[PDB]
Design an enzyme around this catalytic site. Structure first.
Site, PDB file in Angstrom:
ATOM      1  N   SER A 125      56.410  38.134  52.848  1.00 32.59           N
ATOM      2  CA  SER A 125      56.425  36.820  52.659  1.00 32.59           C
ATOM      3  C   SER A 125      57.601  36.211  53.610  1.00 32.59           C
ATOM      4  CB  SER A 125      56.915  36.448  51.154  1.00 32.59           C
ATOM      5  OG  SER A 125      56.416  35.524  50.563  1.00 32.59           O
ATOM      6  N   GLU A 183      46.876  36.118  47.207  1.00 31.90           N
ATOM      7  CA  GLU A 183      48.010  35.754  47.430  1.00 31.90           C
ATOM      8  C   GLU A 183      48.385  34.455  46.700  1.00 31.90           C
ATOM      9  OE1 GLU A 183      49.959  37.686  49.185  1.00 31.90           O
ATOM     10  OE2 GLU A 183      49.015  38.186  50.944  1.00 31.90           O
ATOM     11  N   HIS A 209      50.606  38.606  45.517  1.00 32.28           N
ATOM     12  CA  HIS A 209      51.574  38.579  46.257  1.00 32.28           C
ATOM     13  C   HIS A 209      52.819  39.268  45.987  1.00 32.28           C
ATOM     14  CE1 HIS A 209      53.103  36.299  49.715  1.00 32.28           C
ATOM     15  NE2 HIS A 209      54.305  35.879  48.985  1.00 32.28           N
TER      16      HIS A 209
END
Ligand code: RM0
Ligand code: RM0
Ligand code: NAG
Ligand code: NAG
Ligand code: NAG
Ligand code: NAG
Ligand code: NAG
Ligand code: NAG
Lengths: 532, 532
Positions: B197, B324, B437
């Protein structure tokens, strides 16, 4: 005598014609207007002065003056659409097929031919009314109307060339059927108008025009609708093209009077030789002289008329074919050819997009390109070919028709929608063109019933089905026979949006015909173009 | 002693930790900078003054000051990401796991944590380096860096709060590893940086920044890339948010000097209490204080750097997860809830689109809506939910990463691309969130090897596979073992664009990951927004 009919305009003498080992009466080339020749070129039609004696209605009339397709000399695929009679400005006639013995008061169907408002003939083999009249026991009429500049040159404000006079040709034929079909055994209170392409748009235009609504009962539109992007221009664009036409012919352009007088001195072929030069864009599926939004035939814009319910409320039967676009790509897009599979390179695809949406800016072309490109396989020449095919048909035929059908069903009294996707076994055009623009007509007119034309038995069954759907709809406003055991064609409703396939397989019912692409063509892209 | 190490900054004493019925050495909480406290808040880090004596590196350090997730109290799904150590501005430390016996010169991997640049901790259970270091015999480093305003408040032109100082925190840790890892048995010429990320974007940012390129050999980016729409702001937007922050805290706004001094007097939680109020739009997947395009850390815009090849050329391993977006919709979009299936009404879908593309005008929202709506089934609440999920992940993670990977491969020396789509059997989040995610991290760090954590045997095999892919890549620049009989992970090339799935099934190779949607997000929509 069965072949002699007394009308309000005079007597007419028909001829007995064979049909499917039987016979019916045909009344060919009846005049419904004065010849629009000389000082009358470009003017509204006048009604035909009644005649003494007996009008010989045994033979087909002249066809109107038009551009003639020579792209494939000797090839029946294209020449079956060309005029099959001498061309003449003296061309405002209609033809009637009448069952034998003469009916008393039967359902009437009036055919309006297509051809992009630049061409067309009532006399084509594929429009022969005798099979439909005989099989379904209807009185079958085909009218004619001026095309090209002769029918649609528009100098708004002038009464000599107001525009839309080809639509008024159609209306006067409708007036004549209303006034006289009773004498042929037709019932003037049960007249269905039907047409394909420009003729389908024409049908929609008589639905919208207050001056036309009262002259027919119900309507069938095949592969055409009045809101099509090619079917009408504004008054300013019609004026621009009329002036550009005179500019192509060395006309004095000082005034409408100067321009019209110059154009009236020209021989018909002189106008036809330059007709295509007045288009504003490098385009396909765009025609020079088409109906004009004049505030008279059409009181306001088509979209506002459709939104407010300003149109005749009745039943309509309508539909499209699977591959409406392929004809126009063949004739005008790079990389398409009659005798190859026409696999389309990426360059050629981009060229096709630009010809297809000629009014789009570069962002609009990108939106179209994104919508129709499989980006996992962008160099697939078959996917590029079929993708262009779909673009042309979605944008020019299917999605405008879907917009019309959805606006109309809100106020109408019954809608039936079809998707015709049968490729005929005797088709002379290449495989890649698929189910072509105009190739449902031969089924609508019952050509597969004629053994010598080499259709399959399944295709004869499909033709008889379609002829009976159509005549039953014309008679009752519902294509289905009541209390019948055959599969039923459901009504199209705002909520369910059902339609049927028309092919040799057992009927299947679907919903929301090509809704994904039509949201792009009817909602998103116009918004994109208006903002940019 | 194995637990005692002499570095250029001083001696450190680690601790022996058990791991999988064996043991390795851990050096926890080594300082790499001066504490950025007091008058140093918002400033570039300074290097740590060397110390006398032995630094006790037996325990985890403080975490940096950050917003803390309380949305689901007691719920392990969210709290496993929260700080698990006291928060303090004194937080610039790193942690090293070292195989036993101490290696001589081995491959080094440096973990950079994610968290939208507003949160994150090096000390989370899911970042425990002992399994990776032990299994793959690498020296595993995790660094830390200032987040929130403390790391990214940007008043360009000021040297007291220039911005990007959290990136410089990361770089100084990288400098420290370069200068000192040899003493831990690490090879400073084979350092792989990896992160997820914001940490993946961070990795990409050190690839781009000339001041960072020389401090590492190769790079792994998980679900993040430097060009992400949330990963950076302009200098004007960074200034606007800094001023808005001071406006939220009743600061004198007359000058940068006034503003910075006011913000330095505030206790950390005062800054955190109002941090979210400075966002310019009603948005999801947007964070307040992020890296700034300053002309210094980043010499020019990211896109021009990527186009001109202005970046470190080496090998990269990168990938995304299947879903995600679901995390961010759960926390911020109407109609999504942890304990329902979150079927999404059409109203709610429209609301979601607007939160997801907060910089789009109404035409842009329409383009997005058209691209992700099945118009044959528009009221499908599952299709609306999954459609929003895809919008958020495509726009914020996948398509920016695909843009980065395609620009990078043109100049780089080897790319490996993955699509991680295994849903873990012990996942505590609802089904609808899918492959979330951040939920590949536990496989990258080998948590399924720990029996008490309730993974399946197939998940242990997948984790060992991923750990070995990653360490082998770190060691050689190729995740594949040479002359191995297992299935091979093909190179990603400009021409073929191959990638693999990462799941418990036999490896499958695909091409052109989500190319249809990424053409919309990377080409069409930016063009649409720039023209309108
Ligand atoms: O209703 N059908 C009309 C129809 N029209 C076309 C378009 C052919 C137009 C050719 C125009 N060219 C333009 C250049 O000059 C020579 C003629 C193609 C297929 C069709 O079915
Ligand atoms: O790297 N992960 C960061 C990450 N971030 C989020 C966003 C949660 C942000 C909540 C912001 N709100 C805004 C209103 O005030 C309270 C906090 C959701 C999932 C994630 O994984
Ligand atoms: C109406 C029709 O298509 N007739 C065809 C004819 O043209 C052709 O020469 C013959 C040989 O196959 O087959 C039949
Ligand atoms: C590490 C882990 O998840 N352990 C779980 C535990 O929390 C749970 O109470 C128990 C009952 O099913 O199963 C096991
Ligand atoms: C009608 O015209 C046809 C063809 O011109 C002719 O054969 C027929 O005898 C005519 N009938 C008359 C003149 O009564
Ligand atoms: C058509 O109109 C009649 C009333 O005139 C009404 O009863 C009937 O339901 C309508 N049909 C449709 C399909 O709207
Ligand atoms: C290091 O710190 C831990 C925890 O505070 C302590 O148990 C250990 O004895 C310390 N080692 C020293 C001071 O040498
Ligand atoms: C990487 O660079 C070397 C030369 O330094 C070259 O031989 C090799 O082919 C390159 N590999 C890739 C995948 O580009």
């Amino acid at each position: 005598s069965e072949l002699l009919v007394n009308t309000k305009s005079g007597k007419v003498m028909g001829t007995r014609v064979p049909v499917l080992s039987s016979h019916i009466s045909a009344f060919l080339g009846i005049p419904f207007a004065e010849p629009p020749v000389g000082n009358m070129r470009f003017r509204r039609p006048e009604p035909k002065k009644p005649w003494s004696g007996v009008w010989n209605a045994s033979t087909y009339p002249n066809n109107c003056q038009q551009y003639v397709d020579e792209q494939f000399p000797g090839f029946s695929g294209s020449e079956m659409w060309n005029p099959n009679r001498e061309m003449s400005e003296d061309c405002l006639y209609l033809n009637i097929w009448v069952p034998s013995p003469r009916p008393k008061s039967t359902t009437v169907m009036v055919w309006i031919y297509g051809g992009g408002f630049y061409s067309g003939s009532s006399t084509l083999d594929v429009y022969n009314g005798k099979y439909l009249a005989y099989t379904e026991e209807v009185v079958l009429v085909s009218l004619s109307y001026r095309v090209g500049a002769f029918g649609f040159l528009a100098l708004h404000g002038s009464q000599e060339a107001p525009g839309n006079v080809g639509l008024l040709d159609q209306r006067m034929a409708l007036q004549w059927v209303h006034d006289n079909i009773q004498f042929f055994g037709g019932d003037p209170k049960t007249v269905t108008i039907f047409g394909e392409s420009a003729g389908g748009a024409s049908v929609g235009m008589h639905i919208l025009s207050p001056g036309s609504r009262d002259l027919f009962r119900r309507a069938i539109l095949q592969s055409g609708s009045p809101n099509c992007p090619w079917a009408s221009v504004s008054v300013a664009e019609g004026r621009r093209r009329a002036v550009e036409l005179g500019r192509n012919l060395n006309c004095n352009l000082n005034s409408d009077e100067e321009l019209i007088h110059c154009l009236r001195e020209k021989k018909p072929q002189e106008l036809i030789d330059v007709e295509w030069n007045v288009l504003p864009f490098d385009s396909i599926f765009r025609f020079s002289f088409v109906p004009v939004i004049d505030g008279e035939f059409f009181p306001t814009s088509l979209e506002s008329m459709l939104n407010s319910g300003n149109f005749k409320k009745t039943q309509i039967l309508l539909g499209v074919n699977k591959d409406e676009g392929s004809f126009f790509l063949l004739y005008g897009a790079p990389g398409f050819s009659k005798d190859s599979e026409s696999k389309i390179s990426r360059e050629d695809f981009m060229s096709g997009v630009k010809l297809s949406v000629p009014h789009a800016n570069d962002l609009g072309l990108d939106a179209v390109t994104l919508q129709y490109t499989d980006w996992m396989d962008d160099n697939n020449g078959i996917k590029n070919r079929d993708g262009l095919d779909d673009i042309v048909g979605d944008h020019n035929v299917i999605c405008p028709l879907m917009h019309f059908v959805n606006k109309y069903t809100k106020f109408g009294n019954g809608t039936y929608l079809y998707f015709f996707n049968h490729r005929a076994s005797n088709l002379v055009w290449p495989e890649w063109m698929g189910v072509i623009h105009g190739y449902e007509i031969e089924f609508v007119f019952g050509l597969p019933l004629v053994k010598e034309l080499n259709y399959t038995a399944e295709e004869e069954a499909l033709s008889r089905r379609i002829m009976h759907y159509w005549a039953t709809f014309a008679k009752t406003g519902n294509p289905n026979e009541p209390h019948s055991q055959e599969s039923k064609w459901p009504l199209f409703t705002t909520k369910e949006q059902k339609f049927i396939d028309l092919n040799t397989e057992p009927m299947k019912v679907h919903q929301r015909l090509r809704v994904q692409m039509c949201v792009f063509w009817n909602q998103f892209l116009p918004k994109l173009l208006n903002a940019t």
